[PDB]
């Protein structure tokens, strides 16, 4: 259709544009536009085109509107070749009919409601009133009043009317539907009595409010009766319109929308590019080749194994450029051992999380609902669940390996020579727990420390690469320069870590280590010296975060002592299962906390990443929140 | 490039239609003149012929 000399649109990160542009040139494409800046020159546009487009928009919108009144909206699937005019035409009869039913249907509901409310008090008024509704010789005034209010209005009336009214009420509960009958002559005084009071007349909607009550009542009664049945019919028809028309609506929708995009596309490019990515034009010899591949860096719109699997997807995301310094990707293969490896549980902690994974590949029945995680049906976005199968793999793996460092843990919390712990007793493994014991514990703590060290190096090294390959001497020196300090830092720790080694051995070396630092920090000149203290907080942080990942972990395993070996009396094999009153609970409590746990790692990681150590999402900047990023 | 080849050829086809029209606007003029002239000689052939026949008539009458 439109773009008769025919469009391809590619979209993306701003930096990639030249490389993208090159990929597009290769494909078989011709007449590549705009190519920096914008504003095509005899390949633009006219409102005629726009008008026709407007017609597609009208249909598009219309299909949605009608779909709306019914309820739901369509999904990307099968458009189909149409007349645009045809599409517009198509929409009209069906929509109007459905819309018509809708229009009646709300009106019916309202009718039903109103009628229901009014009929009974009005009936009460009518019953008192008869003979005198008619008369305008005499006048009668309906109003409803409640039974406290029965003295207050009665006083207002009494003052005006005296006794020249005879004053009537009929009950219907919640008050009595009331009449004053007065002479017609007395009418203002009577109405005024209501006015002083603030008591209100049962005037009702429409013609009905105005009426002789008895007669009015008949009509009102009829509405009450009629409306639910009427509603049923209309509702059936509407329901009927969904059942049949939902596919129809969709096909139209898909078409109309796509067309709307398609049309739009032509219009924006016509004028003025994607932005920083790239359009262009093909004769139909050029047209088949071009779309299919042209290397992932971009989004277009058309006219061992565990370790490979999400990473494989990160290989492409390596390839998106911006600079000669290396790009986002690393996070997923970097996380995994520790991620899993905070989880260091036992029979009742870690080792049952498989069941949950088995409820993501098998499911559950025993409470309300779940059916298939692959079909990800939900209380809050379904969609996501289908997408995050990449995550479903990593999670199934997370538990599996996590269970396993729990089982590493139960090597050292079973076996009778290693600790006092049973090899496999009459209660349960991991029984009178002892990794808590300070010396044993000390080792597990110190275990945590190491991963933090890795991170110190990994980040600053990447800074030196930043300036290396983005060429900034400023970045280079900054990333490199801090390492000048480091030998001396290692000295100071060591004098306590070995209690000896340095700090008075390599502390003479400290005297020279401190100067080396400030040399190239000084080469940039840098009044921006002070910061170096703050860097000192960070190292310790790695330790602490890991430390907690251990400690809170460890604590968790030691909580299964007070979960399942003991928690009232001392827990043997019956009071043990008097703890099982609590035991089921502890699983769900355990569930809550562990969501908490993982996020520290990533926070940790983010400290490094968004100090621009390998990552060009960071406080914005193309690429997008890391939250969204790593998951594929 | 196949696009610009086509852009040339088209504009060039557009030229071909301008010329063809212009030619026709010349031809119609050419043919107008031709009729116009024919019609004029006719008017004077008629009259003179008559003015002859009658004149001589007056010669006879004398």
From Swiss-Prot, chain B:
Name of protein: V-type ATP synthase subunit E
Gene from which the chain derives: atpE
Similarity comment: Belongs to the V-ATPase E subunit family.
Species assigned in the record: Thermus thermophilus (strain ATCC 27634 / DSM 579 / HB8)
Physiological role: Produces ATP from ADP in the presence of a proton gradient across the membrane.
